[PDB]
């Protein structure tokens, strides 16, 4: 999930936008 | 800003700024 992709590992804009509505 | 380790309120803040008026969903356990 988001914690695995952005918190435990380095986040990216590409990934963040996957969570916008 | 976006390209770093973002956790907790720091992650929530990033989603808020990036998604803007679109809003977002935060699911820690998924």
If DSSP states are collapsed to H, E and C, what string results for chain B?
CCCCCCCCHHHHHHHHHHHHHHCECCCCCC
Q: Is the CB of A1 less than 8 angstroms away from the CB of B27?
A: yes
Rounded Cα distance, B26 and B29, in Å: 9
The contact set of A with B (CB < 8 A) is 1-3, 6-13, 16-17, 19-21
Rounded Cα distance, B6 and A4, in Å: 10
- Spans of all domains in chain B: 1-30
Residues in chain A with CB shorter than 8 Å from the CB of B5 are 6-11
Long-range contacts of A13-19 (CB under 8 A, 24+ apart): A13/B2, A13/B3, A13/B18, A16/B2, A16/B14, A16/B15, A16/B18, A16/B19, A17/B18, A17/B19, A19/B15, A19/B19, A19/B24, A19/B25, A19/B26
Does B11 contact chain A (CB < 8 Å)? yes
């Amino acid at each position: 999930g988001i914690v695995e992709q952005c918190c435990t590992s380095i986040c990216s804009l590409y990934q963040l936008e996957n969570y916008c509505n | 800003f976006v390209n770093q380790h973002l956790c907790g309120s720091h992650l929530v803040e990033a989603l808020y700024l990036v998604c803007g008026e679109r809003g977002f969903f935060y699911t820690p356990k998924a």
